[PDB]
Each structure stands twice: as C-alpha cells, then as structure tokens.
DNA sequence: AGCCCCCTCACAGACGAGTGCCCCGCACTTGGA
DNA sequence: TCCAAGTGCGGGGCACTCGTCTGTGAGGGGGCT
C-alpha cells in the first residue's frame, strides 16, 4: 500500500515482512531485520526443494512516490534469477501515466 | 588468465578488448590485483552481465571469493557490509555481526591465508553512482580496502557516469578507469545476428509452411533482414536489448509472405515505420464523471489563462498557479447548470488531486485555510476530447 | 601581545575605512599581512592568525560567527573604538596604523 | 618452453613490487630521521611527544610510518617496552568506536578478547584511570592517528583533549603521531587542544618536482635488482615477520633471476627510457601530476600488458597507455549517443549560444528541434515520446543537470563546454549531412 | 569472566593496573647535561614553587584559608588564556593547604576534582564526584540523589570538601542544571562546599549563563593575565638551573618571540626542547642563537608558499587563473567555468596545452584536499564554487621568485 | 476615472547545524525454582 | 545448582529549534488614455 511506502527502507521492510508473514499465515520477526538478505536466505531454505513465484501487488499506482517506485523496481529487477518476482500494478488513469512516470533506465528492465 | 577470456568470447561477441583488459588486470589469482577498477559506459553496453559472468568464471576456475552488489539495496552501510561479509566469508549463518566499517575490516583481516593457495577476493558494486549519496566514508574505504585489510582483493565499480563526478572535498585514492564503448552499426548487426541458431530452432519448433521455412531462413536472409531493420531503427536507439526484442517481433511479421508463398521492403516498411512510433514502450478512453470533467477543464482554463484575463471572459512558461476558490469560481462560471456546493464536489477536487490529474505546487498543509495552490497537469488534446464528449468548446475560452 | 595589538589595529582600520560591517578572517588576514609588511614585522600564517583572533575573542572585544570553512568566520567588534584606544595604550603605534590606510 | 616462465616471473615480481612493499621509502633523509629519533626517545627515555606528519595526498606518509616502525620494532628494546595503537579517521567515525578500539588494542582489564563491557563513560573513566596510574616505570603507548582532521571534527574534540593531556602530564609516556593531508589542520583545534599540542610539524612534500628525478624514479621502478639485494631484503622482511602489513608483504626471496636476464632487462629499460617518445609521455604525466601514485598506476597498467607474444617493453606501448590516460571521457560518452540525443544536444547548444547560458526546458528545446525536424527529410515523423525518452537519457548520464513541477517543465543546465560538442561533431561515426549542416549554423 | 569483572570494577575493588616494562628505566648518571636540560624543560614537570605567579598564589591561598577556617562554603571564579598558570597555582594552593592540615595547623578537609573536558555528558559529573567520595560507580540519578541526601541534610561532624571544577564551559548546556546544582549546594548552610571554577573566557558569567547562575556564582573573580617578555624568560631560566647549556640571548629570543604571539608558557617550553633536540644533532653541547632561530622557524611554520612551489605545472596554471579570475570579476567566490576559461587563455599564452575539464576537476579536487582552495563536491561539474584559500600575493611570491 | 505596472516585505520554503527526547535493545538479576 | 521475565540503563533514530537565506503574492505606490 502507498501509505506504508513513504521511503525506500520502509517499502523494502513492508515487502519482506508481507512475504514472510504470508508464509507464516498460509502454513514474529521485528521490522529491523526485514531485508532482502533474510528474504533470500528464507527462500533458499524453504522453497528451493520443490518454482514458487513472488507476486507484488501495487493497488494504487498513481499515489506512490516516484523515486521510491523507481528504486523499488530497480531493486526487484536486480534480484531476478535468484528470486522469481512477478509484479502487478493497479493503474487507474491510462497507460500514458505508466509510460510517463517510468524513466528510460527504469523501463529498460520492464516486460509489461 | 586466457582460459577465462576463451570462455567469455563466445558469450560476448564484439567485446574483445574489454575482456582482454579484464584478463590482464584481474585474470589470474596468483598475480596481485589492482586497488580498484571502474569500468563505465552507456545503458545496454553489457557491464552487469560481463562482470557477472566474469566473476562466475573466476569463482569456478580458481580460488577466488567473489561478491556482487547493487548500491540501491544499500540505503545504509550496515546492510551493504552484511551482504559483503556473507559473500566473502560464506557459510556463517545468522551469527554474522557487523556494526560498522571497523568490524568489517577486522573480519576481513581474519581471512588472510598463506602464500601457496593463491587466493583472491573480487567485489563488484553495480549502480555505483549511489555510493556518493550515502554516509560518505564508504567510498574511500572501498577504494583502499586492499591496503586496509591487507588482502589480495580488487573492488570493481559499475556506473554510467565518468569518474569526474565521484571526487569529494577530502579526495580519493587511485583507480583504474576503463571504458566500454557502445557499438556502431556493424557490430550491432553482428550481435543481432549471433542468435540466428535460436531463431531457426524457434521457427523449426512451431505442413508445407515449415518445410519451406527450413530452406530459406538462413544466414544471408537474416543478414539482409537485419540490414533492412537497422537501416530504419538505428536513428532512434543504439541499445542492444530494445533492438533484439523489437527485431524478434518485426521478424515474426516479416516472414509471412515468404511462408504464404527487393520484394519485401514495402510489406515490412509499412509496419516498421508503424513500430518506430512504438519504440521505448515495452508493451507486449479514461472515464470520468460529469462534474469531474467540468472541474478538470476548469482547472485547465485556470492554469492556461492569466489572472487578469478572467474578468473579461467569465462575467457574461508552464501552467500557472491557482487556488481552489479560483477553480470553483471558473467552474460555476462555465457550468451554466448552477448546482449546489455539496460534499461530493470538493471530494471530486480531492480525488482529482489523488489521481495525479492535478497537483499541489505549494501550500498543501493549509488546504482548508485557502493558502494552498493547485496546478493542472494535462495537455490540450485530452481537454478537447473531454469537451467533445461533453459539448463544451474550450477553443472559445482560450 | 604585539600580534594581537596589530590585529586590533587592522580591525579598527577596516571598520573605519569601510562602510559594511562584514569582516571575514581572510580579508582581515590579507590587510594584516600588508600592515605587517609595511612595519617590517614578521607576519603570521592563517593557521596561527585564527588562533590569535580566538585568543583575543576570550577577552570580550570580539565575537566570531562560525561558518563552514575557517576563512569565512565573521569577526564582530563588540566594543567602542575609544575603549580599544584606552585598552591598547600604544598611542604612537595605534595612531600610526590608522593613518596608514594604503593597505585597505 | 622457458622464455615464457621468465616473463611471468618478471611480471609477477614487478606487479607485487608496485602494489605491495609498504615498508620501503625513497628519499626523506631528514624527516625519517626526525620521526625515528622521536619514537626512539619516547621508547628509551620515557618522554611524551606529539608529532604531525603533513603533506599532499599521494606522498609517502603511511610508508614513512611503516618504514620507521619496521626498522624500530625488531630491536627487542623497542618491541618489549612499547605497545602501538593504530587508529584511522575513516573507520573510527565516532568517539566510542575509537575508544573501544583503544581498549581492545591496549589489552586493558575490561578487554576480554575483543569485546569491551560498559558504556562510553565507563570506558573513558577506566582508560584515563589506567593511564593516570602509570609512570616512567610503565610501558610506552604509541598512538598513531591517521586522517587527523576527521578526528578534529568530533564532539568537543574530547578524545583529542585526552590524548594531548597525558602527553603534558606525569603519567604513562604516550606519543601521539597524527598523519593528515590538510596543510591547515591546526586551525581546526580548540584553543586548549592548540595549547596542549607540541607544535612540531613534519612536512612531506615530494622531492621529484624536477623531471630528471621523475625519470630516475621511473627507471628504478622497472629494473630488476641483484641477488644479494633480494637476499638482504628477504632477510629484513623475515626479521620483521618473525615478531598489520607483514602477513601479506612483498617478500622477494621467492624470485631468483638469471644475471643475463637481469642485464638484458635493465639494458632494454635504459634503452627505452633514453628515447624521446617515452620521455614525452613521462613529460605529459609529469606536467599533470608529480605524485608517486599516478606514476605507479601508469606503470602497473603498462606492466600488465606484458604477454609472451610481445614480451619486451617498448616506447610505443608507453605512448599507447599515455594516450589512454590523456583522453577525455565525456567526449567518449558523447560519441556513444544516438542521433536523436545528438540533435537534442545541438538544439541545447544553439539555445545556450543565443541566450548566453540561460536555463532551458523540454518544451523550448523540443520546439527548436521540431523547427529543424520538419525540414530535415530524415527525422520527419519522430513523436514527442521518443524525444522525451531521449531527454531522459540525457538527464541520467549527467549531460544535463537540474537547477538544484512536471518533468516536461523543469528547468535545466547544460553541463558541457562548447569545445567538447565541437570535438564530438568531429569524432562521431556515420553522422548524416543534415545534422552536420545544422551543427555549424 | 564478564560478570565478576564488571561487578568488581563497578564497585571499585580491583586496582586498574598498567603493564610494566621488561627493561628497567635508565639512570640519571647515564644522562648528559643537554639531556638533563631536555628532561628538566618538560611541560609535565611542574616546579615546587611557581615563578612570577606569586600574587595570584597569595590571593587564592588567602581565600581558601578563610573559607576553610570559617566553615561556611562559597564560590570562586578564576579565568585566563590557556598556559598562564591557573591549574598549577590552584593545585599548589591545595597541596599547601593539605600539608598545613597534616601538621595540625589547619582544620582538615577533603579535596574533590572534576574536569568538564573528560566527561561525555555533563551529568556524568555526578558520577565522578561520588566516585571521589566513596569509590563505587553508580548511575547518575542515584549519584545525584545520594549527593542531595549528603549535602542538604545536617550531619555533624561534617568535614569541609573543596570541589575543583576545571573547564566549566563544557558543563553549560541548554538547560543548565548541572552547573546550577554545583553552584547551588554552597548556598545551603549544612553543606560546607567551597567550589573554585576555572575557565578561559573572562566574560563567561555574562555570555552564556542564566541570571540565577551568575547571581549564585558571585563577584570574587580572578584573572590570570598572559605572560610578558620578562616573566617568560624567568620561567625558562629557573627551569634550566645553573647549567650553561642555554645562552642568555637564546632564552631572550625564545621569550620575546613567544610572548609576542600568545603569552603561552607551553609554547616556550616546547620551543626550547626542540632547540635542545636540534643542538643534539649538531654534535655540540651548547644552544647558540642559530639552533634557537631554526627551532623558531620549524615550530612557528608557514608552508603555504613551499606547497605552491612544490605543486605541478598545471596546478600552478590553475592557481594563476583563479587569482586572475578573482582579479577580473571582483568577487572572491568564483565558478569553475570562468576559471577554466582563464585557464585556457593562460595556457594559450604560455604555449602548453591544458587537459580537458575531466582532468581539471581532478586538479581542483587535489587542490581542495590540500586546502589550497575551497571547493565543493565534484558532482556538479562546470558549476561548482571555488574560493581561494591562500592569499593572492602568495601565488605571485611563489611563482615569480 | 477606474485602471496599468513596479516595489517590497514579512510568509513559504529550504536548509543546516545541532541538540534534546523517546523507543528499543539488552545485560542484570533476582527472588524464585 | 540454574532461570523467566521485569527492569534499569545506554544508544541511536528522530523531531524540534534557532538561525540563515531566498523567492514571492499581494498590498501599496506612482503613472495612464
Ligand atoms: N557484446 C554483447 N554480446 C551479446 N549480448 C550482449 C552484448 N552486450 C550486451 N548484451 C546483452 O545486453 C544485456 C546486458 O544488459 P546489462 O544488464 O549489462 O545492462 P547494463 O549495462 O546494466 O545497463 P544499466 O547499467 O543501464 O542497467 C544482456 O542480456 C546481453 O544479452
Ligand atoms: N617516498 C616514497 N617512497 C616509496 N614509495 C612511495 C613514496 N611516496 C609514495 N610512494 C608510493 O605511493 C603509494 C601511496 O603511498 P602512501 O600510502 O604513503 O600515501 P598516503 O599519503 O598514505 O595516502 P593517503 O594520505 O591518501 O592515505 C604507495 O604505493 C607507495 O608505494
Ligand atoms: N609560572 C610558571 N612557572 C613554572 N611553570 C609554569 C608556569 N606557568 C606555566 N607553567 C608550566 O606550563 C604548564 C601550564 O599548565 P597550566 O596548569 O597553566 O594549564 P592551564 O592554564 O590549566 O591550561 P587550560 O587553561 O588549557 O586548562 C604547566 O605544566 C607548567 O609546568
Ligand atoms: Mg547494471
Ligand atoms: Mg595514509
Ligand atoms: Mg587546567
């Protein structure tokens, strides 16, 4: 949600905490130790033996900050190959807003 | 050092001299490494993939301990040092504790070994231009980590900027600058023609059509197709991945008269110039309420007109700034329906703000007091489309 | 001391012969260097001149507004010029510096 | 084969001499003597001293400290009576981190194999209590503070006030050597810390301003030494390793060269450095930077070219690495741009030439570009979207900088001179005729 | 183990010892007379009686003897520039009073001392005073509660406790409660506290203290004037003794050159030690005028002209162009663009070609690390600001001559 | 005969040091087990 | 012999705060067709 993603640090903590607590709900760690290192260790510990995708739902795409969104897309695109990420969006207005709020270097790594 | 180059030359055509230079510098692990290497270029030049495959081959063939980062993940230094010490000192578990740079330097000093096993360490920090936007004592320490830790390590940095943007007030150490030049048209044609075998296997694995598809899909035909493609798309972009992902689709369009039984430049030059308008879009009618449409065109008329021009029209150098009372006055002037001021209209103003169709150029904390300013961020053709689906001509009030 | 007397002399000279009251440490040092070069007195470096001004600051004659770099610190005189003339008690020197306005 | 293994051994010897070998200096017959006599009179008599090595970044400051310590520590009267505490301004970025490092390195009673207990105040009280309880019958502590101005930028300079208070008191005979690059570091101190500091300063300006000393240094850095010199150097390095750098040091006892190979290599090095092209390359490098790290970087990148196909060092390789150094990087980024970004840069150059370095926009530059694109007959039907993406590509490579609103109405600045664009117009490959005609007018 | 070590350190039961030398220290007979003058000129060796600090000694001794023999408590404020015999005179007065209280000439007392520049926060003063009362380290709130229980309540026979507070200006914070508590306890009748505070600035009670704190601090001030030319020769000639190692004009020139800059005694006692160390290397036994002049040149150093002489060629061209741009456009804060334009003009004049701005930014960063100029981060190239940190005449003196 | 165009001055914003406050980890630890 | 959870306390993140600094919107002042 856009309300819990004011900074990049809070958005990464919200993402890793949401994935780990989705795992704990389907089958408590503090938010200080919610990083991509712990997420990669947990995904290598649990789901490598079976691929389970990691879906990141963004319901309000327009209400997000621009810089936090671009750094989040670059973070999720940096970790592909090791963690299977699928991204869906919730864009309300049109596709021109998507192509306008995403710069050249961010849209270089997008297959929408 | 030649085995790594011989293993990297098939995977990276037309990248010969960079692989030879990186095999001179950090090729063999018995020789000492330079203090820091900084190779840079444009987007799509192939530096993340090149150093990633180079680090994988060095960790596979020799006794080095590689590491690969990304400096957008490292918003503070502790995460960066924990990832570095997980990669450089493996299989330690959750009992790895790094508080600052000093504990990291001591725990790397503990990894020193003898002079017979010929060990090395290799750190690659992708998106290095963020390293100058953090706590300011990570860049010189990353430059002189070989002298500090007294190890045989090299710190590789990857960015799109030259190194002239990295100097601070306190100064930096010495670095080995390396440039990855972008390809011209012939080398881009060779790179786009490298995947001819995968193209032929994909067109074989998907019947007189397939039997005629096997006889003329060959190397010279694909070379003429890539020549006709690069004769029209090289003007806009020189980047390899966009050209690959677009040349695949234009090839799938290009082949259909040859499979349906010059002779081909017009039939593709229609859709090639139709697809040049679809470059830089990676894609594989906006409905609004009535009063939201009128509020949107009233905000456009408030942003596109001067304050002194409103008195002549309504009485009966970007967009300008305006307050909410000006928007409401222009809306009730151009409405000619004279509805009341309810909750839903100001709620429509607020949800037009939250749809990024308006903005808050200033104020934004005293919105109720009236000192907040707005700014309309739409063009002219959407305003005229809204005015056509409503029936209100905006070409008069401009 | 002698160098503190010379610093106070050049500060009183710069506050007499110049309207705006923003006096940095670098401008005061560059006037003081010419004043010492005319008097055949061995001038100090900037790194010792800053310590000299900081030692005159303890008496209460000056007040230093702090900036980012030590050349930019603002020196504010907080006395009257007659109090400085009474405190220095070097009348043949302090009347010779304030008449030597060629260094400003 | 055997002619390849000699070249591999020569290249390995030269690279491990250029990168490693932290304890050998060249020159400084007075400064090294002053530092050595100061540390020796601290260790022997038990006097407390303060010192401040000053010099430019790139001279032998750390090498001088390592050479003095490597010549003093195997004395068995220095290494048994003294203990050395190294602190760095880049790693110890606070007061409590440096204080826990002092408490670990001095082996105090609350050390416990590298995990200090108590707070910052208890560590400070215990360190001052263990320093006050000493005298002239106690071990001498030698504090070595590198990046001294970063220690000057701490809270109240309070650690510095303690480190200069034991030096001016009847306590354990410490000796504080600061090593910094700022030539005006003494103006950052408070007046009490200024008073407690003994004002001796050692200046380490390099003695290779004249070009012949640069040529003799570049000749001494490439030549192979004899056998007896390598035995003596391996003896000294083994003596300082018997009792930190020495775990991974040069140690040249592993390499033994034939005398005919050494004489052929030194004859080739003198023959190459006696030419005019090599001296012109070294003259350009000496005009730029007379530092030692610049020449060692150039020599490392020249020695790394030694392959068994082209085994000898020639003047043409030196000229090639000199042209690798002397070239520009923003011009090499400018010739990698496509034609749309290049015509946008020409439109920006025209707007900045007309309006005399005024801030521009996307709409102004797009209007000036579309005034040309409608009559270009090769860039006729390019939209606003591709030009906006090309403007973003210019914005992310920092050829356009923001003045520090929408992205299409944000003001900007051109971050290039006009000579760089004029050279980009000459070095561009396959530039069409219309763009070259529009660039000149 | 951690637990018993912390419980025995915090309770003050183990000796905080320091390691001993394996080799025994040297003898006094093995030292030469120049070595004896070098060890007797140390700043650590305080004499048993201070020369030229007699009037302030009798002032503080009369004040403290009156406050001890009256058993009433009070406050004093001494002030002066660093190096002028403040703490040495105060501890000499306190040692004299302790020796008089040993001989049953004076009523006995306790002596507590704190320094504000070895405390991490001012509230740790409460931890230190109590540590000089009992020996046990506690938290600051419990130590403050125990000090308030000790001082405000009457308990005969209470002994007088003289509290010395060095570096008072560090105990001053936004709230000013520590200095208020230290200057407030003498104002009670049950607490026989006599506090003497030492500071550098003469106007500390008016500049940063509140009104009640400067009302409680009193008006019995004291000022330590700096050393003149005549007293700073007497100090060194009393330190050296009857040895003929230092000539008269050597000590006279040292005192005249030091007493004209600051009036510090540490500066003279370090310049004389450096002159002794210089004359040790010349294989002589006396300190002439030449070694003193060489030590005066070395200690009071000015090496911003040798640094410009020892720069490269392009950095001298860069400094000439920054000076010419400052001369042209009047104002001192320049931009890198006009600096590079004047660089190109000067390099066209001299004939040598200049590197592109990608290396001129490296030259500007190298001059900024050396603090010859003042420049920003290089992320805003061709628009960064440049101040000339050296004087514009130093460049002309370093390049013409 | 109300209107057209500069002046300017305390809010708006930034920003930057800088300093105190509150949450949070974390050993102590202790009366109990 | 140990121990579960309160708890006492230090440390870092954060938020206010004082001073500086600069745009600037609209009230105010001088001319107008
Ligand atoms: N010489 C080459 N031969 C074959 N493929 C190449 C070559 N150069 C690049 N590529 C292709 O380009 C891709 C590499 O993109 P990469 O991740 O390196 O972009 P990048 O350099 O990191 O750009 P940015 O820094 O802007 O993200 C690879 O998938 C590779 O197939
Ligand atoms: N006098 C010298 N003799 C031998 N080598 C030198 C000398 N001066 C510099 N060097 C070489 O320069 C390189 C850097 O030297 P050094 O580590 O002393 O610089 P530094 O002053 O410590 O740098 P910084 O102050 O930035 O840490 C070393 O590799 C060293 O070999
Ligand atoms: N009159 C004197 N006679 C002999 N020695 C002196 C005299 N004055 C100062 N000294 C020497 O100079 C040193 C000055 O120490 P002092 O106690 O004056 O420091 P301080 O003034 O308290 O410093 P600060 O003001 O920075 O706290 C002493 O070690 C002492 O040996
Ligand atoms: Mg990349
Ligand atoms: Mg160093
Ligand atoms: Mg004192």
Automatic annotation (TrEMBL), chain A:
Family in the record: Belongs to the ORC3 family.
Subunit structure: Component of ORC, a complex composed of at least 6 subunits: ORC1, ORC2, ORC3, ORC4, ORC5 and ORC6. ORC is regulated in a cell-cycle dependent manner. It is sequentially assembled at the exit from anaphase of mitosis and disassembled as cells enter S phase.
Function: Component of the origin recognition complex (ORC) that binds origins of replication. DNA-binding is ATP-dependent. The specific DNA sequences that define origins of replication have not been identified yet. ORC is required to assemble the pre-replication complex necessary to initiate DNA replication. Binds histone H3 and H4 trimethylation marks H3K9me3, H3K27me3 and H4K20me3.
Protein name, as recorded: Origin recognition complex subunit 3
Cell location: Nucleus
Source organism superkingdom: Eukaryota
Organism taxonomic ancestry: Eukaryota, Metazoa, Ecdysozoa, Arthropoda, Hexapoda
Membrane-spanning parts: none
From TrEMBL, chain C:
Domain called Cdc6 C-terminal: residue spans: 8-88
Cellular localisation: Nucleus
Function, as annotated: Involved in the initiation of DNA replication. Also participates in checkpoint controls that ensure DNA replication is completed before mitosis is initiated.
Sequence similarity: Belongs to the CDC6/cdc18 family.
Name of the protein in its database record: Cell division control protein
Lineage: Eukaryota, Metazoa, Ecdysozoa, Arthropoda, Hexapoda
Gene: Cdc6
Residue span relative to the full protein: 557 to 660 of 662
From TrEMBL, chain D:
Main location: nucleus
Chain sites annotated for binding Mg(2+) 1: 62
SUPFAM superfamilies: P-loop containing nucleoside triphosphate hydrolases
Residues in AAA+ ATPase domain copies: 47-207
Gene Ontology cellular-component annotations: cytoplasm; nuclear origin of replication recognition complex; nuclear pore; nucleus
Gene3D superfamilies given in the database record: P-loop containing nucleotide triphosphate hydrolases
Ligand binding (ATP 1): 26, 57-58, 60-63, 181, 292, 296
UniProt keywords, alphabetically: ATP-binding, DNA replication, DNA-binding, Metal-binding, Nucleotide-binding, Nucleus
Compartment(s) where it occurs, according to its Swiss-Prot or TrEMBL record: Nucleus
List of residues binding Mg(2+) 2: 62, 146
Residues at which ATP 2 binds: 196
GO biological process, one term: DNA replication initiation
Description of how the protein assembles with itself and partners: Component of ORC, a complex composed of at least 6 subunits: ORC1, ORC2, ORC3, ORC4, ORC5 and ORC6. ORC is regulated in a cell-cycle dependent manner. It is sequentially assembled at the exit from anaphase of mitosis and disassembled as cells enter S phase. Interacts with DBF4. Interacts with POLQ.
Family membership noted in the UniProt record: Belongs to the ORC4 family.
PANTHER family per UniProt: ORIGIN RECOGNITION COMPLEX SUBUNIT 4
Task of the protein: Component of the origin recognition complex (ORC) that binds origins of replication.
Identification of the protein by name: Origin recognition complex subunit 4
